[model samples]
Target: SHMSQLAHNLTLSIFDPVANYRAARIICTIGPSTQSVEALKGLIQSGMSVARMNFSHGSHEYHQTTINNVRQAAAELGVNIAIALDTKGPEIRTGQFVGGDAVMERGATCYVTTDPAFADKGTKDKFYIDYQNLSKVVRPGNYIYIDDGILILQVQSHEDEQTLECTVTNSHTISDRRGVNLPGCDVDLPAVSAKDRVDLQFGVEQGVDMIFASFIRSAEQVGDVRKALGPKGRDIMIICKIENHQGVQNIDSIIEESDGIMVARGDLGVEIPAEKVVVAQKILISKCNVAGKPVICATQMLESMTYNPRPTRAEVSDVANAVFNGADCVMLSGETAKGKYPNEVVQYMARICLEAQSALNEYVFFNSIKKLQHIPMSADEAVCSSAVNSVYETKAKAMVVLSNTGRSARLVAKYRPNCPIVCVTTRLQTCRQLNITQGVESVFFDADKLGHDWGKEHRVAAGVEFAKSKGYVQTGDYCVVIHADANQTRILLVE
Candidate 1:
C-alpha cells in the first residue's frame, strides 16, 4: 500500500459523460437571439431547463409569439421545457426634459405629474410620469428609487389627483425613461401591476408551467396571483419573487403559501441595502431548503457573458455559491437574452452546478431531508424515503418511476436519492412541470403513440428504456423502482 501513499500534485481535469448530468436546473431568460427554433434547441443542449420571459422588456404581443416559439422549439426534442412568466412590478420612469437630462437636487421638493399637459417640458419643479396609477401605489413616507437609487424620492401628500409631492434623498441627473424602484412600503399594489394582471390571464391561456409574481409583499399577495390565474390556471405553479425588505422580512409565510421562491436580486439589491443582499440570498435559499421547497437563485449570474462569449470567474463562482446554498436553480438574468453567448451561459451554469453538486455530501443532503421531513408522512413518502435508503446502500445508478401524475417521482426527488429520478408519464404538463424539480428528468410516454399496452409494468419498462438510452443505466447498473400507488419497491438489474 505504501507504493501509492504519496498524493500526486498534478492531475488531469476531465468531463465524465455520466457525471455531466446536472441535478440542479439551469433557468435561462428567453429573448432576442433565443427567439429562433434552432437557438432554443441549442439552449436545451446547453442545459436550459426553464425559459423565462423577461417582464420589464417584453410586451404581451411580443411574448404571445415568444410562448409559441418556445413551445415549438421545446416540442422538437425531449421532455417539455417549461415556460415561466415574470410579472415585474411598477416600472416607473422620469418623463422628457430639456437638454435631455437634469440633475435631481438632494433634499429638494419635487412634483411628479400624471398630467398630459407636459410632454417634452420639465424641470426640478415638476416632472411628468406616464404611470397614472402611481398616485394610488404610493402614499406619504413611501420611497421610490430612480436611476437605481442615485435619485431617491420619498412620497408626500398628493398636491392634486395629477401630481404627487415628494422629497428627494439623493441627487442625480436623470434621462428619459429613467427607471423607478419602490422600497419597504406596504403594497396593495399587493404589488401586482395593472399590466401584470392581464399578463397572468395570458399566462393562464398559454398553458405555461410556472409564474413568478415579482415584488410579492405577503403570502396573501401570492394568493392574489393565484386568484388572477383563476381555475383555468390551477395547474400552473405560482412562484413568489422576494425582492424588497418586507418580503425578506416576511419570508416564512410567503414560502408557505407559494409553490416556490426566486431570490430576484436584480430588483432586490435595488430595493434594500446592497450590503445585506448576499445575506438575504443565503437566508432565503437556506430556509426554502428546510421547507422542502424549490428556491431559485436568480439575477445577474453571468452579466459579463450576456455580451461577451466568456464569463468572468466571479460569475462562475456565484453560480457555484447558489448551488451550494441549496438553490434548486440558478437563473441567468440577461445571459440567455443576448445572442452571442446564450448557449455558453447555459453550458457553464449546467457544468458549474454539476461540479458544485458533486462536492455537496450526499448523506448530508439525505439526512437533512430525513430530519426535516414530518414523522407522520404518507406511505408514498415513506416508500420514497426507504427507496432512497436502498439507493444509498446499493449505490443505484438511477431511480425509475411509473407515475402518470409525476407525484411518485417528485417524492423520490425530495429525498436526494443521488440519481436521476426518471418520471415516465402520459401527461404533457407532468413532463413540462417536473423540469423544475431537482434531480428529475421527465419523459413523456404515450402508449397509443408507441403502440404499447397501457399497463403499469409497460410504463415501468418504458422508464427503464428511457433510462438505458440516456446511459443512466448500463448492462450491470442497479436501479430503485417505484410506482404511484406505493405498491412496489424493487431493485432491478440493468437490461
Candidate 2:
C-alpha cells in the first residue's frame, strides 16, 4: 500500500539517538501536580516507567480520574507504563489533639489510651492512640516516635488493657493523626486494615498492575493481601514494604511470599535506628537480587526537589547509590506528586541513573549470580543466562525477547543484562508488569491475529523492528533475540 510505504519512509527520516538510554526504572507518584493529562504525558516522556497512586490520601473519584488520565497519556504515547496502588495498610497514628498541637516537654508524663472515652482530645499529658492492640504489643522501655520522629516517647508501663503510661523523651509539637512508630516491638495488628480492604478492592477494579502493601510484618500478611486481590488478581504484583522492625526481622520469609519489596526508609527509619536503615537498604536489595524479585529503594530519593528545581548533591548520590546497589526502581513520592518541578525531577533521576549505570561493574553482578549457593540452574535458566552472556560476547547493543506471558523476559532480566531487555509481549498487562523489573522495557503486539507459526515469526520480527524504532538497535548494530522455543536464541544484525 502507498500508506505503508509512506509510514516506512517517515520512520527512517527521523533519527533516534541511543545516548539517552536508561536501563534503571523511575516510578513517580501522581497527585494534584501531575493529575492533568498533559502533565502525565510529560512524565511518561521524561522517563517515568511507573505511576504510583498513594491510596492514603486521595478520594475514590479523584483516583479514578487520575487512572483515566494515565491510560490516556500512555495510549497517546504508545508506551506501557505500570500503575501501582500504594495501600495505607494498618498505619498507626494519634487520633486527635485539643490544640491541634500537643507540646510535651522532656521528662513529662503522658498517657496513651485506645479507648476514645478516656480522652476526647489530646492534651499535653493524655491522648488517644488508634491501634487497639497498642497496650498488648508495646512493653516497658519501648520508644514511640510521632510526627515523623520529631517527638519521642518511651513506654514507662502498660497501665491496663487499654492504657499505656509513657514519658516524653524528646519535646516537640504533635498534631492530629500524626504517625506513631513503635521501635523494637511487634505490633500485632491486621496487615490489611478494614480501610485497606476497601482501597485494595478499588485498586483491583481499576486494573492496577501493582499494589504496594505498607507495614507488612509477616509472609502471612502478604498472603492475606493476595487473598483480598482474589481470582482476578493473580497477575497483580504485591510489593511488601519493609518499614518496621518485625518486617526487617522476617525479611527473607516476606521476600519469599511477596512479588517485590520496597525499602521504605521513612517509617523504617522511625522504627529502627537511623544508621541501621542504611545497612538494611543494602541487605534488602541484595536479598531481592538473589531471589530474582524486584526491589525498590524508595522514600525521599530526591526529596529536596519537591520544593527546589534541583536536588542536593547528597540526594543525587543517594539515587546513584541505589542504582549501583542493584535497585530495580527508585521512587519519587512528593517529588512528582506535589513537587514544583515534577518533570524535571524525573528527568534528573533518569540522568543520574544512566550516569551511575555507566560506572557500575557488570562483573560484580555476574559474579554474584555465579556465587549463589545450593540453587541448581534448570535448562530454561541456563538458556536465559547464556542469552545474557551472548550480549557481551557479541557486543550487542540490546536483547529482544518475544514472550507471550513475560516469563522469558523476566528470566533474561534476572541475569542483570548490561543492555536493555526489550520485551515484546502479546499481553498488555504483562508489558506493564515488566516495568518494575530491572533493565526491561515492554511493548505490546497482538500476534494471535496471525496463525500460530506465522505469529511466532511476526512477533520476533516485530520485536526487532520495535527495537530499531526505539534506537536500541539500528542498521549495522548487533541484537540478540531470545525466544520460548527450545534452542531458538539467535543473534542478528539489524538491517
Candidate 3:
C-alpha cells in the first residue's frame, strides 16, 4: 500500500507537460456507416482529422454527397479538416457472375475472356478481365491473381481471340467484380484511365485538399496525374499510393515528384510477399520522413476494430511501431468506412497515437534528422532547424510558424518537435492541407490585404494568439517563433 501510493505519485510526475495533443494525423475513410452528419461529427470529435473518399466503390454522385457531408460537419464543428480524393487508378478487375456467385474448384480448367459480351455472364468455366492485351502480355506458366490474390489461375496457353486458358488454383468463392493482380509481370496499363481522369476533374471542381492517386508505379505516372489535374487543380497535393513492387523499385523518383507517399499495404501485400510489406513500410516511411514529405502508413492498421469496438493488442503495437518508424500520419480504411465501430475506432487510434508520441525520445529523434542534410542549410531550413532546437533549449511550450504555402510549417514539423507546431496561414486551403503534417495545428489568418512588413506581425501574432486560445500555451508560457518570409527566428514570452 505504501509503495503503491508513491508509484501513483511518480506516474503523475512523469507528465509535467502532458501529451494532451495528437501529433500524427488520422485519415478516416467515410462510407455507409459514417456518412451521416451526426456520425461524421462523432468521428471528428474522436480525432478524425482527414476524411478520405475511396473512389474505388462509389459513384460520382455518391462522392459529391460525401464531400458535402464532410465540409458541413467540419464547418459545424469549426475545425479545419482536409478531404482527400482517392483515385481508382488503372487496375485489372473481373466481371460479374451469372447467378449468386461462382465456386471454382482447384485444379479445374478455366478461361479468362476480354470480351464485353460476357461482362455480366461470368461462370465457373470462364470470366472476364477488361485487359484486352491480357493474352498478349501473359504467357503459359504465368499466374493470375484474383480478389486481392485470394484466387489464382496458372496460365495453360493462349486460346481464341480475347481468351486465355488456365488451371484454377487456390479456389475461393468470388462474386461480382474483383481486382486481378499480375504479380512479377510488367503489365502495360495506362497511368490514368478515363474514369480516373473524370474523378480527378470532379476532385478539382469540388476543391478537395489532396489527391491519393492509386497505384502510382513510377514518376511518369505521377506526372500523368499532375497533367490530368491540369492548371485548375495544379496546386492540389498529390500523395501517391505505392501498392506494387514497381513503385517500391522507383521510390526515389516517385518521392521526388510527388507531394507525399502512402504505404498502401493492401495491394502491396498482394503484389509482393506479405513479409516484404513490413520491410517496404519501414523503407517508405523513413524515406518520406527524410525528404520532409508526409508519409501515411495505411491499410488494416486497426482492421479488427471494424467489427469489434476494441482493437486487438497487436493492432495497438503496430500503431506504436508506425510512430517509432516516423510516420506523419496513420490511416484507417474499412475500419471507419462501413465499420460498425467507426467513432470508437478513431478514439482508440487517437489515444494510442498520443501515448506513442509521449514515449518517443524527442532530442534524440531531432538530432538524428538534424545532421542528415549538409551544413550551411538554406535560410528557411536554418530558421526551422534553429526554431525547433530552441524549443528544447528553452523548454518552449509551443512552436509558432508563419507559412503562406505551408512549406515552412512542414519543414519545422519535419524536425519532430515534441511541442505543438502552430502554423499560421493566410490561405484557407493551406490550413486544410497542413492537417496531415505531424504536430502541425494550422490556423487560417483571414485578414484584409496588407503590406509585407505588417503581414508578418499579423500572422505571427495570430499563431501565438491561437496557441493561447487553444490553451496550448498560457500567459507566461514560452513559444519559439519562426517566420520564413522575414528570415527570422525568435523566442516569444506569451503576454
| Models sorted by lDDT, best on top | 3, 2, 1
lDDT of 1 by residue, 1-495 (tens): 211112211222345333646789988888888878889899987898888887777778888877888888877875478899988665666677777786787888998887867647877778887666777677789877877566788888899888989888888878866767666543334366667788888889888889977878787888878888899988788888887777898999999999889998877877677668988999998788777667899788878887787888988888888887778888886677865788887887788899877765556667777878768977888887899999989999998876766677767777788788888888878887777778888767776787665456777787888889987898899998887584578899987
Worst 10 residues of 3 by lDDT: 1-10
TM-scores of all predicted structures: 0.87, 0.89, 0.93
lDDT against the true structure, per candidate, is: 0.79, 0.84, 0.88
Residue 175 lDDT in model 2?
A: 68
Per-residue alpha-carbon lDDT of candidate 2 for residues 204-240, written as tens digits (9 for 90 to 100): 8989999999988888989999988887777789999
| Model 2 alpha-carbon miss at residue 220, Å | 2.4
Candidate 3 lDDT for residue 456: 77
Give stretches of model 3 more than 4 Å off: 1-18, 449-455
Per TM-score, what order, best first?
3, 2, 1
**By the TM-score metric, which is better: model 1 or model 2?**
2
Looking at model 1, the pairs that clash are none
Cα error of candidate 1 at position 76, Å: 2.9
Q: Which stretch of 10 consecutive residues in model 2 shows the poorest summed lDDT? A: 1-10
Report how far residue 93 has shifted in candidate 2, in Å. 1.0
Model 3 has an lDDT value of 0.88
> How many angstroms is residue 114 displaced in model 3 relative to the true structure, after the best TM-score fit?
1.3
